[PDB]
Design a protein around this nucleic acid. Structure first.
Ligand SMILES: [Zn+2]
Lengths: 132, 136, 83, 145, 101
RNA sequence: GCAAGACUGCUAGCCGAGUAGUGUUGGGUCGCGAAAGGCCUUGUGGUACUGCCUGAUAGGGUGCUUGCGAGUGCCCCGGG
RNA sequence: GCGCAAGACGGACCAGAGCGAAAGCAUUUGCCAAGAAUGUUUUCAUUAAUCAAGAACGAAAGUCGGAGGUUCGAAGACGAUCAGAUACCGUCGUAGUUCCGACCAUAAACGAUGCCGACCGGCGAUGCGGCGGCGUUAUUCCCAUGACCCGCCGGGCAGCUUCCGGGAAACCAAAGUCUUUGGGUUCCGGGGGGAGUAUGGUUGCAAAGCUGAAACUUAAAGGAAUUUGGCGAAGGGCACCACC
């Protein structure tokens, strides 16, 4: 079989993490890049490294990868978790309040609120899976 | 074999009892009463060595022979009465019951109701063997 | 937990516990009254009657013996009394 | 019983149940009630009826035991005996085997045992005869129409 | 030493139960100790059902099932490979083996 | 005697009429339940659905589709 | 396939469910007697706990005398297996297995863990009795009863979890509250073998049961756990110095 070694995989992962804008999907081109920007003591090791780099490009061009962090692929996560919507999902016109917690809230600090309503309780009390 | 019947209007129904054990198969065919039989062919009549009596091939050969004799006589449909050794010995049927039933199905007959008549007891009689059973 | 006010707890815990495991043991039973529409008399019976009780004048039956509290006859009103 | 010519006129001899349902109705975590009676019809025919009843698990039930007390089983069996005794003593053979084609006896058993404990599968497992009287040609002829 | 929390059986306050017999053997084993197996089987196996339904006169004929209960002595059970030995840490798993098909 | 409130049952013109019949496990003040005949305002509007049986569009069983898990379809009268 | 006759047993339902001091107890129904738990604002007032002497019960096997003996089956008779096989296996088969009456008091009679009583964490459940509550059903209204659901109390068979704690550890909510050593009380062990042996006593028709030494010999015999080890142990892979 053809299973890559920790040395080849580690070198390919770190050469993707350091360099990303100087590579591609063509095997011979980024083989020449990997020859130029690194020191590799053999031709066969260089070809194996460039092959795993091409496989890493084919993995990366689909979606996110859980082992490699790329600065061009970074800033997207904080782009998605920085912006906010106009509705805060906490200030509505109706709040689903049970009569039991309504009576609890009346005992707490209040007699009436401007945004609460009372629903009806269920007719049957079943809440657990049948196991005996 | 003969009578005023017609082969197109109706079909002749019989009842076949399949005794399957772990030593031999009894492919028996009776009438609708069950009192009087047509032909009784057993799995030992085909093979010569008794080790092949529990083989499915002997049950297939016996079932094919009794089925060709019965459809030569004029019985077309069969009701299945599968029965194991029974009693206190063994509830599981033998290895030749499936092969015998498939050979009856492929011979050109017809199959009606299927039921099992293994004689399960109401915990009656002490089993064969001692307290420690068979040692091997 | 570790800190429990065993001097005076909430009365739910005394009403929930056994009749002998409280700080001061007290029965959970009470004395009760029976009034019928048919007979114009009032009799005082125990909650756990454990016997057949007849009203004064032999008008109607009033109680039925059970394992626990008695089965009052249907149509009879009651209220708890204390001194 | 007799042949006139080329015809075998038949008569009732017993009722059985198939073994498949007999070992398919029995399940774990449920109980059984069985009753057997020696009742005789309004003619000279004596029957012997066997019955079996099982346990209904409710729809909103979380418990997997579904057992019952012993006195409830005795009361259910007593209801079974008085139902089976009451329903056949006023009738003859034709009416009881006409009733045997549906499960009206089983329906009355499972409807009588409703306030005691629910039952979900009630069937008459077996019918046997013990006493055979003198054969009558006219009764068998009227039994065939 | 003490191998199990119980004694390999299911009696806690009894002292004596009625004995039963093995199926492969004839060994007398107590009822709560023997490894029961209520197997659910039918008449034909996988591929004869098409031939049976082709030869069956009644259309949409439902097939019957065979219900037997099998009782095994533990030596005959292990020799038949229905139960296997487990590790010391994973012995305390009373959950049944998972069924899929 | 004063004074209005919160909740609920039946009916969809009303009186006949909750009278028989049926009904169960134990009862009750007991469920289910239509006319004969008469007087009128001469019959209040909206809204989805309906596999078969028992005992309601409820309750409890149990089906058909392609083998399973899940959709959809299955009161009747008609037309295309 | 239809019937008859005899004896034995009570399958599926049957579960880490119930009762009983223990040995043990499973077809429906009838009769007699007893008992735990629960309920009580009933009754007496310390009647209580453990126990030499003594007493009752006590699986199977074994003995005596009957009736009966279906199946199974010591001893025995053979056939194979094997170098030997009076063993595993297969076919017959006497006592015995079943019931009554009279014996003996032996088990891994084991939870290998004396009885009573106080304290010391949590959680999901199970069986019983009692208490309280939204709802569905025994066809539609009410109440009580049964059947579900939600919780509580008391006794019990258990289960999961925990760095309470203990132990040599396996493990135990008791085997904890133990050097910071004392709640009450009965029996019982001082390295291994000789030896549960010999004599004596007692009991028994008999077999045997209880009580129970000594000379001599020995430097270890053991309990828990760890690591390659070997399995005619199981689960996955490999090799023409293995096979097909
Ligand atoms: Zn075995």
């Amino acid at each position: 079989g053809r299973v890559r070694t920790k040395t080849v995989k580690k070198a390919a992962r770190v050469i993707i993490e350091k360099y990303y804008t100087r590579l591609g999907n063509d095997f011979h081109t980024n083989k020449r890049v990997c020859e130029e920007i690194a020191i590799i003591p053999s031709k066969k090791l260089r070809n194996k490294i460039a092959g795993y780099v091409t496989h890493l490009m084919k993995r990366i061009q689909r979606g996110p990868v859980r082992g490699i962090s790329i600065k061009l692929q970074e800033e997207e996560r904080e782009r998605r978790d920085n912006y906010v919507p106009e509705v805060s999902a906490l200030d509505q016109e109706i709040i689903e309040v049970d009569p039991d917690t309504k009576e609890m809230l009346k005992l707490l600090d209040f007699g009436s609120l401007s945004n609460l309503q009372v629903t009806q309780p269920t007719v049957g009390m079943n809440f657990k899976t049948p196991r005996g | 074999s003969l009578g005023p019947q017609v082969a197109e209007g109706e079909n002749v129904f019989g009842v076949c009892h399949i005794f399957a054990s772990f030593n031999d198969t009894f492919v028996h065919v009776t009438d609708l009463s069950g009192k009087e039989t047509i032909c009784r062919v057993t799995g030992g009549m085909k093979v010569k060595a008794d080790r092949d009596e529990s083989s499915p091939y002997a049950a297939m050969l016996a079932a094919q022979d009794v089925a060709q004799r019965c459809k030569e006589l004029g019985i077309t449909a069969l009701h299945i009465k599968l029965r194991a050794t029974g009693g206190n010995r063994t509830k599981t049927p033998g290895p030749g019951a499936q092969s015998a039933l498939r050979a009856l199905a492929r011979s050109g007959m017809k199959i009606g109701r299927i039921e099992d008549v293994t004689p399960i007891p109401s915990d009656s009689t002490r089993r064969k063997g001692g307290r420690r059973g068979r040692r091997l | 937990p570790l800190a429990k006010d065993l001097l005076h707890p909430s009365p739910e815990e005394e009403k929930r516990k056994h009749k002998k495991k409280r700080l001061v043991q007290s029965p959970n039973s009470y004395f009760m009254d029976v009034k019928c529409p048919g007979c114009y008399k009032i009799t005082t019976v125990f909650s756990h009657a454990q016997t057949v009780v007849l009203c004064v004048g032999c008008s109607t039956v009033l109680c039925q013996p059970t394992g626990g509290k008695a089965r009052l006859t249907e149509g009879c009103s009651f209220r708890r009394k204390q001194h | 019983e007799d042949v006139q010519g080329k015809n075998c006129l038949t008569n009732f001899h017993g009722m059985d149940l198939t073994r498949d349902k007999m070992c398919s109705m029995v399940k774990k975590w449920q109980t059984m009630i069985e009753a057997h009676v020696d009742v005789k019809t309004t003619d000279g025919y004596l029957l012997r009826l066997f019955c079996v009843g099982f346990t209904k698990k409710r729809n909103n039930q979380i418990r997997k035991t579904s057992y019952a007390q012993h006195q409830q089983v005795r009361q259910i069996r007593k209801k079974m005996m008085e139902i089976m005794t009451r329903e056949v003593q006023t009738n003859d053979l034709k009416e009881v085997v006409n009733k045997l084609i549906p499960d009206s006896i089983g329906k009355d058993i499972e409807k009588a045992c409703q306030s005691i404990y629910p039952l979900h599968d009630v069937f008459v497992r077996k019918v046997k005869m013990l006493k055979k009287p003198k054969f009558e040609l006219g009764k068998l002829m009227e039994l065939h129409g | 030493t003490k191998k199990r929390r119980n004694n390999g059986r299911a009696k806690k306050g009894r002292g004596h139960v009625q004995p039963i017999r093995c199926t492969n053997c004839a060994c007398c084993v107590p009822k709560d100790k023997a490894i029961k197996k209520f197997v659910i089987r039918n008449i034909v196996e996988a591929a004869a059902v098409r031939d049976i339904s082709e030869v069956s006169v009644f259309d949409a004929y439902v097939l019957p099932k065979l219900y037997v209960k099998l009782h095994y002595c533990v030596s005959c059970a292990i020799h038949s490979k229905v139960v296997r030995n487990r590790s010391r840490e994973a012995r305390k798993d009373r959950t049944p083996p998972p069924r899929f098909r």
